[PDB]
Amino acid sequence: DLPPVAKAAQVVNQTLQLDDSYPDLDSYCRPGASSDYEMQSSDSSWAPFHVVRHHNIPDKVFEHLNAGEVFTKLGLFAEIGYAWASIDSSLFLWDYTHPNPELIGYEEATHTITAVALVPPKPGVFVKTITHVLVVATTSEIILLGVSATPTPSGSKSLTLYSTRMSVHRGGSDVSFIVGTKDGRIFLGGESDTDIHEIFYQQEERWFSSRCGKINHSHPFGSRQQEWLRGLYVDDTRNLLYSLSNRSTIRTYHMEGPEKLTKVIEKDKTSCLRDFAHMADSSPLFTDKTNIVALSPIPATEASKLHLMALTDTGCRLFLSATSSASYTALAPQSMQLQFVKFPPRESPTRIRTLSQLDKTSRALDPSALGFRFSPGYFFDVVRKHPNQDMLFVSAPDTGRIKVTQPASALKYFEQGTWIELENGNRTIEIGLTTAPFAAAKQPLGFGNELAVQFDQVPGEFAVLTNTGVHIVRRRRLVDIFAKALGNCVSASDDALEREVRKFINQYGRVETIAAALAVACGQGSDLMDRNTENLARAAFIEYGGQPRLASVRLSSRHDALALYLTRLVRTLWKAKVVQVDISSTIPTSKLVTIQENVERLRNFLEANKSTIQGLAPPDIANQKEHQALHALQKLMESISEGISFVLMLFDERVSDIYARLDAVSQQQLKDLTYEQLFSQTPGKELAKVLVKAIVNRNIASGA
Amino acid sequence: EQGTWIELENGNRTIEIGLTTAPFAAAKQPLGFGNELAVQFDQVPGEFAVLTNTGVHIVRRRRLVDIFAKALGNCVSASDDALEREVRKFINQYGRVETIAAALAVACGQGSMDRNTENLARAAFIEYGGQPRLAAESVRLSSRHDALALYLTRLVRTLWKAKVVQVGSGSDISSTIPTLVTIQENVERLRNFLEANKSTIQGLAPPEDIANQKEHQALHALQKLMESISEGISFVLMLFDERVSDIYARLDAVSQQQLKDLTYEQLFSQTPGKELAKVLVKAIVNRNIAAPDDVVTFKAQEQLQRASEQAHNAPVLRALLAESLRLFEQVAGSLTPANLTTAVEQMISLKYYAGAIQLCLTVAQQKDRGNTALSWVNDGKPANDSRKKAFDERKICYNLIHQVLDKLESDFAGEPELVDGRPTLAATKRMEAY
C-alpha cells in the first residue's frame, strides 16, 4: 500500500521529532542543586574541549604597551577575528588569525581610552557595506566610527574605518562597559555609579537636535550610597538588559520601546541568599561574604523560565528564573528568584593521572575571577588559586547522557569537564565566541541537541585572550571523540575495540554509538592512520550493530543508526520550502552541494560493503523487514540526491522566467513545495516532471 | 521527612556528634536556604563524626543523585519494565523534571559496574524525558529540556551573578582558581554527553512541528551557552595566568570600571561582556609584542615590540621590522585606526620610514579595492553618499603618511646629504621613503 521512499520518509519524520524532543534546560535544571561531573584529562581522547592553536600578540603592540605612561587595556572582537589594544589616548586593532598582522592605528582621541566595543549598526542609517559600529569611550567623550568587516580570500575579515561626525561629551560618569543590541542600540555603564546611559544617533542633522545624543536612563536623585558596575549584559530575545554591581546586586531593565529603558527588577545579594536558604541544600560556598563576579544571559530560545546564570567567586553557578506578574499587556518580568545551583567539581588539575551525594563543599574553582557561558551551556571559568598562573576549567552538558536519560523525572545537569592549563605568566582577560551562535532548534525543546547538528554547523570555537596571545579552544563532538578513541585502538586486540565501544554505549546508547561509527566510517571527523580509523569504524558498525527481532518488529540498532545519520544530514532541508518567491532558493546552493556529497558518500559506503553488512544483501520475518527497511532508506537516499540535483539544475537556468510562463495551479504547487514532498511524494515527482518539461522549452529559446 | 535507623555494633555508647564538613546553606535568606537539590554539585555532602567509647563513626548525607545511581545499580541484572517501575517511584516523589535531571547527572559521572549504571541513567533520560507540546503562539517544552536547563544552572549557580574580579587597587579574583576548573570540567562533561548522543537524544538532531521545532531551538540555545560558559571560564583563567593588575593600571576608566562590575552572566551572554573580553585580550597581545587574521595581527605587534627592545643589530632589527611589515600587510584590510597608528609610530621611532609608508598605502588599497573613493572624488563628493566611509578610511592612512615624512625631515634636520663624497644613511632613507 505504501511504497519504499514513503515508508523511509515516515522514519525520517519520526526521527526529526525525536531529535527535537531533546530536553530543555528548565527540565534538567529543576529547582534544587547538582554536582554531577565526569572529569576528563585534557590530553584524553574524551576531552570535551582542547586547544587547537595560539596567536602571539604582535611585537609592535608590546612596544606600545611597554611605552604606556598611565593606562593600557586589551580586548577581543571574536566575532570577526580581531583583537585590540589601547595605550593612553591611542587604539590599535589587528587580525589575530593573520600570521604577521598589520596594526590598524587610530589616534584621533585626545584623552585616555577607557572602553572599546564593536556593535551592530542602527538600520537605515549607514550604507549597507557598513557591518559594525566601533564605540570608543574616553574620559572626555564617546566616539562612534563606522566599520566594514568584509571577508577576504584567506578567511579573515578585512577591516576599514569610517568617520561619522557622531560624538558626545561623556560627563561625570566613567564608561568601562559598552554593549550593543541586535538593532544597534548602544548602552553604557562604568565604575562611577550604577547609572545606565544610552547613545542615540541618526543620519539627518536638525536645527533642534544633533546627529548624536546621550541620556541617563536611571534618573538618579537624592541620597545615594557608593556602588558601581562590574558588567552589562544584553538578551535580545527578551528585550532585556542586565547590570551587575560591585555589591553583587543584579538589576534587570526592559526595553519597552525603541528609545525606552525601564528598570523592572532589583535583586541584591541578600535576596539571592534568602532564596538559597530556602533551598534544601545550603552551603558554605555561598554566604554574605561571597561575591558574584559575572553574569551570563540565557535566551528565551534556550529556556523559558531560567533567564540568567550568575557565577560566584567560589565557583557556584546560580541559575535564576524571572516571571511576569501577568500574561498580557514584549512582556516585562517583575520578579527574579534563585532556583537552581550547579556546585563546583572536586577534581583538581594534576600532572600525573590520578585515580553519589550532592557535593556542595568543593573548593576546586575557588577563587573564580572570570566566567563565561555560551549556549547550549559551554562554561569557561578562570580559576586564580595562584597569583601568577590561571587555570581554565571548561565543561559542557553531557548531551549524550541527557538525551538517553529516562524517565524525565530522572533528568539532572550532567556535565563533561576538563582543565586546560595556561603557561606561567598568562593572565586571561576575555573569552569570546568565534563561530556562529549555537542552536539546534528554535525553541527550548530540541535547542541543546549537539548530536543533531554534528554535521550541519562546525564545532564551536572560542578565542581566549591573555596578556601574551590568543588561544583557540574548540568543542569536540561525539564523532571527534569516537574517531580519536578508535585511533588509539589501531594497535590493539579485537577485545580492545569492544572495550572502548562499551564505554560509548554506556554513555550515549547503542544507536548513537553505531551512528558515530557510521559517520567516522564515511569520513566525518577526517577534516581534522585515517584509513585504519575509518576501517575500524566500519568494523564497529558491522560487529556491534545488533540484529532485528520479534517484539510488528524491532529493527536492529544498525538500521536506526543509518536512519539517524541520514536524517541529521538533511534536517535543514526536509521541512523547508524549496523556493522563496523574483523567485529564489530557500537553501543556499553551497549548502545543497555539501548535503548531497554527504548523502552520496554514505551511499558509496553502503555499496562498497553490500556483502559484509547484514541486511543489505537479500536473506525469518525479522531479517525480512530488516532488508525491506534498509532497502527503503537506500531508495530515499538516491531520491534525495536526484531531488537536490534537480533543484540545482533549476536555479542554473532562469527560474523567474520559467515561473512567469506558468499556470497558477503549478505556481501555487511550487510555492508551497517542500523538500520532503520532492523526495518522497508523487506530487513532487509529477511537478518535477512538469518543470523539466518547461525548462527545456526555455533552454531552446536561449538555444545555447 | 526521610528517616532511617543506624545501628553501630552494640556495647558502645554514643558520646557526641559533630559536623566535619562546612555548614550547609543553599541561600543567604530563609527562602531557598534548605534546597539540598540546588547544591549537590557545589557542596560536599554533609559528613558527621559520631563519637562512641570505642571509636569515631563517619555518617554521610546521601543526595538525590546518590540514591538514583544506586537504585539504577539494582536494575542492571533486573528486567526491562523494572526500570520503568523504579523510575516512577522517583517521579511520584521528586517530580518528572527533578528525576530526569538526576538521570542526566548520573549519566555524566555524578553519583556516589559504573558503566552499566551510567548507560541506564542515559536510557532513562531518553525514554522518560517526555516531549514538547503546545498549550492554549506558545509551546511547553519537554521535561528533558527543563532537566538540562536545571542541571546546567546548578553547575554555574555560584558564579553566575558573581563579579568576575575584586578590586582594592589592582588585585583579586572572586571565584577561586581551582573551583573554576571544576565548574569548567563539569560543564564540558555535560557538553560531551550531548554530542556523544546527538543521534539518540530527541530534539538535538534536526526535525506537532512548531512544538518540536521550538524544542530544537531551545536546546540549541542551551548548547551555545555551554560552550560560551566554557570559553568564558577559559578566558578568566587566562587573565590571572598573565600579569593582570599591570593591564588594569594601564587601562582607561570606563575600561577599568566596566571590569569592576563585570559579572559572569554578562561575560557569558551579553555583548558588553564580549566587547570587554576583546579589549582585555587585545591588551595582553599588544604587550608581549610591546582566526589567521586576528592571530597574525598579534604576532606582528610582538615582532615590532621586540624590534624596539633591541640594541640595534642591523640583522636582528631589520629582520624584526621586515617581518612585522610582512605580517601587517597580510591583514591590512582588517587593521583598525588605533592599531595602524601605534604600529606606524613605532616604525617611525626605529627609522623605518619607507616601511611605515608602504603599510599605510597597502591598508588604504585593501579597505577599498573597488576604488569607491576615487569615484566619490570624481563625482564632487556628494554629501549623504556612502562612499565617504571608504574615503575616510584612506584619509587616515594618508595622514599617517604625512606624519612619517614630517618626522623624517625633522629627524634629519641639519644632516648632510653627502659625506666624504658618497651618500649618508640619512640621505638613503630619504630617497627610499620618497
Partner: peptide, 14 residues
C-alpha cells in the same frame, strides 16, 4: 600607520 578614515558621505545614506 594611521588608519585611513573614509568620509561620512560614503558611510551614511542617502
Amino acid at each position: 600607520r594611521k588608519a585611513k578614515l573614509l568620509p561620512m558621505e560614503e558611510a551614511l545614506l542617502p
